[PDB]
């Protein structure tokens, strides 16, 4: 009965109990007989995703790994994408495989390539949309029905980029939604954290097996506070993030020194029509190709005076990165090529600065 | 040169960098490049200096220290030897992912010698142990475990603390702490610590922590622990002075049958404890001649001691596990605080007269 | 010269010295010195920030709004000085005359020779006062300083130093921090009075030191300062019309509001506080307030949650007076909760 | 119960929160003064054995909030000329600028405090031990003089000694104040002040001086840190003193030092007064090197453990040379005394 800002600001409040609207910080570890702060944040994110239960962990990787250590075992099979955000790619290709888990990598945008990758022992289909680093879109509802043909399969979606402001995968059939709260949900570049939302049945097992026993990735109470506090402005931050991005996209698309732009809002974008039906907005992550390749990325980034060179995203400050010179410096040509880092690719996370100043720093920087 | 107090206070200082003795709290999730966590790092160096290992790693819980390590050094097929009495992970979690586990009485040197398989990748130890404060010989066990070129010895040093016991000086490969207890000292942080040689540490950081657990300690929690470490030596002193005065009062007491404490010569592994440990701890278990209700009643009339399951806090904690494996139904576990010993004893003395 | 969001987010940052955009929290009391040959780096960033937003020379942080005004007042006054402000000090040899600061002539005719401080607050039933016109007046005495509590308006609507005011003070406790969890005060003015207020008022007279943690919190709050104020006012504009269809509504954006023209002239926006007067008595207000789901019953202003107050149940005040602090919620849910409660 | 148990447990709300650790009420807005800070106010007040405690955001915040409450233009203050730095500035240039009379005497001489009383003398303000040479004064006898005048409150700055050593309220003092920034927090990471006094006096200090005249509010996080720091308050002071006592012996005999000011040295002016007020003689040491100015510089610039800083009462040993910096004082920290002595010796060499 209540809107997104309202939900984020008030869901889970304990004002009738403490007399404060602001949740006290229970910086404690010894409860007495004869964590409250984290719970509020868990009830909040659940409300925002419209699921039954939330779980907080100390990082995005803590939220994913705790979930996968709970619902997997040796002998299980996992279907995911050839390109995921790293760290979860290392967990998939190197970590689970040392412990008897089969992992098939496919193009999740191809619906049938997902269908025929599936086996009796498939326990997890794990998806990302939008996804690094060309913002691949992927039809979550189409994929969830092509995976529940197997009555034992869970669909897990990393909803970090879209946030519950643009996408609620649990409404499109998904079973488990995971967030890197480090990005947009906290929003303030000062917290590593992760969140999970799923049914109460599943959530209780991820908390009491995967979190308590398999990772121990507890979120600190002060960090739980920082995220509750961050959420008070979640809605207007995403509004300004997305409003700034759209203008920056047009700037980059009509720029002579720029060859291509990757952005789910463009109609030239691959999964454009898919992106339009499941996303209320087209996101604040923009990627684009540079004409002058490697040395054009270096020179562009080395002249920007307002944008900050970093490999996080979702901060109130605008962050820019050039995977080839930085993140993927010690890689091969074909390691980077497919998929999908090229020599000119630049990643931008649009912050909340006044868009005129972001573009002015972009403009002078492109020359 | 430096004493334990000097080491815990100054090891890893960056006072040359910030012009401050107190380490700034780098509450950040984004580092920026010149071209195309220091708070936690200070704490990682601190625990390493105290245990006299190469390298420290911090995690958001004790279980995040232990799990991060085991996901690093194990794979499907490996075998683990550990003690009978973290248990869910050993007994249910690893076995679900193709690791084999043998539980033995690490008390008996030859049960360990005989549980050794060739694919034994980890001997995982803990001393003193729960809840009867079982002692276990770390040096003897490392020689046993190391006749396999591939076996790592991992010791949970949470109870002993590097004030009383440095397992790496006795041949151990890896030390883990639930920093939640004595190292932080203040009942207000969940956190874990690992100390090992540089190459094992790098692998635990960049495989176990980064990809397998993601148990990142919050910078603010790191700061609290650094601050807790400023009083680590005097706290362990007062913990252990208190605890010894209290042990006597409980041994020579009418309604207490037995008192589990490594400092008593009647305690099973007292001679091992005495060579291993610079002191005998601040955990006291004991049994009341009343069993249950001894027991469930004594704990109800306590007015200073608090009813909790954690340990190593500034306040004295107590619990009665009966409210099948070591838990004799008259057993009571005391975690001795920093209070004045008169007041703890008087409180205990009072609540003992109520039965 | 960048936009309000860019300077709120980026002004005063030491991002190339720490390798992070987030300022390290210097939870410290004692600095070491390199060789044998009163301020905090985190706090210092905050002071630089509010100074850049007010387009002033220097900022000072204090552990409360009252710490901010009392620190400056104990600097710039002595026994025998005189103060004029709008309808404590007197126990220590300063005389205070209270005038209606919206009567230009009533202020000008109250200027004594020993008048050292004129202290204004606009908005305040949201009374407006002409800050430029009142400053020319006070400035007829060379040793008179004008001090404006710019808390209600913000540097997003009002920059008093650009209208000839000498000192801006804020209870950052309200809009600037935004999130209801910090008591703090701020002061912006010229460098040399700033150094006087710090080294005398703050150092010896009050000791009202802002904690570095609270300073970090406020810097964080300022990261969304521009978009919070946008959203606040927009919600206020929609709720103000709704409330105005209760006999009367006090809001500087209604042209039927007394200082509407001074307001339009000085304030780039009309603010996010609303007062209105309920037709029913002392017991129709308390009945409304004892009956809202969303709005919360509290005496403060500028949070993310919408707050409301019936100053009667909780001279100036009537039995039908209600103060509304419009939060950041979705507008329809706010309006719905006002509505359901009015019935 | 004992001083450790009190500092750990006084003011507990374990019955209501289900935790031994006080949650951090990081709030400004209450629905229908702070619960974390309150727990700390009851803690200090139990430690000093007064009725009520107040917390301010600074030692100066504690002091000025007290003075701005109990004084008025026309009143008179008797205080010492050797006073803590910023208390001096306030007393000398601040009160006098708002109608207050201050006479600076030597509070060692009971005859010249008696002879500085006036009918309108509202406050006698004392400091024992006192900078920069650990001066001692008789709290009983001075409170007996001041109280012959029926409107005179005696205010004592109990920072150095702390309630581990000196409880002025039991010696007849009316108000005790603290820079909790030092020993009480203990950890060199908080700026805070504390007042302990009678309830009626405290309510006025709270609701006049704090609420209206200074607004020197302690943040709730800073309040949490101090409650935490107090969890070990007893054992830090015990170790502070044992270290400093041994450094005292060492410093008293080193050929390159003239005199060693410390209250436990029976050679010290005021020794027998300290022996009756003080349960222990403190952890500040000062001394004079025969090399004078260039000896101080060259000592402090060869210390590798002792840190060169202004403050005192931290877990780290702090050192400062009053001729090189503020215009030799030693704050003994919690290190092993052997390490501290050896760092002093290798630096005394030079």
Curated annotation (Swiss-Prot), chain C:
It is an enzyme of class 4 (lyase). Its EC number is 4.4.1.11, 4.4.1.2, 4.4.1.28. InterPro entries: Cys/Met-Metab_PyrdxlP-dep_enz, Cys_met_metab_PP, L-Met_gamma_lys, PyrdxlP-dep_Trfase, PyrdxlP-dep_Trfase_major, PyrdxlP-dep_Trfase_small. The modification N6-(pyridoxal phosphate)lysine is found at residue 174. Pyridoxal 5'-phosphate binds at residues 65-66, 171-173. Signal peptide: none annotated. Keywords: Lyase, Pyridoxal phosphate. It catalyses: L-methionine + H2O = methanethiol + 2-oxobutanoate + NH4(+); L-homocysteine + H2O = 2-oxobutanoate + hydrogen sulfide + NH4(+) + H(+); L-cysteine + H2O = hydrogen sulfide + pyruvate + NH4(+) + H(+). One of its GO terms (biological process) is transsulfuration. GO terms for cellular component: cytoplasm. Substrate binds at residue 323. Homotetramer. Catalyzes the alpha,gamma-elimination of L-methionine to produce methanethiol, 2-oxobutanoate and ammonia, and that of L-homocysteine. Can also use L-cysteine as substrate, catalyzing its alpha,beta-elimination; this activity seems to only minimally contribute to the production of hydrogen sulfide (H2S) by F.nucleatum in the oral cavity, which is toxic for a large variety of cells in periodontal regions. This is L-methionine gamma-lyase. It comes from Fusobacterium nucleatum subsp. nucleatum (strain ATCC 25586 / DSM 15643 / BCRC 10681 / CIP 101130 / JCM 8532 / KCTC 2640 / LMG 13131 / VPI 4355). The lineage of its organism: Bacteria, Fusobacteriati, Fusobacteriota, Fusobacteriia, Fusobacteriales.
UniProtKB/Swiss-Prot annotation, chain D:
Pyridoxal 5'-phosphate binds at residues 59-60, 179-181. It comes from the Bacteria. Disulfide bonds: none annotated. CDD domains: CGS_like (cd00614). It catalyses: L-methionine + H2O = methanethiol + 2-oxobutanoate + NH4(+); L-homocysteine + H2O = 2-oxobutanoate + hydrogen sulfide + NH4(+) + H(+); L-cysteine + H2O = hydrogen sulfide + pyruvate + NH4(+) + H(+). Keywords: Lyase, Pyridoxal phosphate. This is L-methionine gamma-lyase. The lineage of its organism: Bacteria, Fusobacteriati, Fusobacteriota, Fusobacteriia, Fusobacteriales.
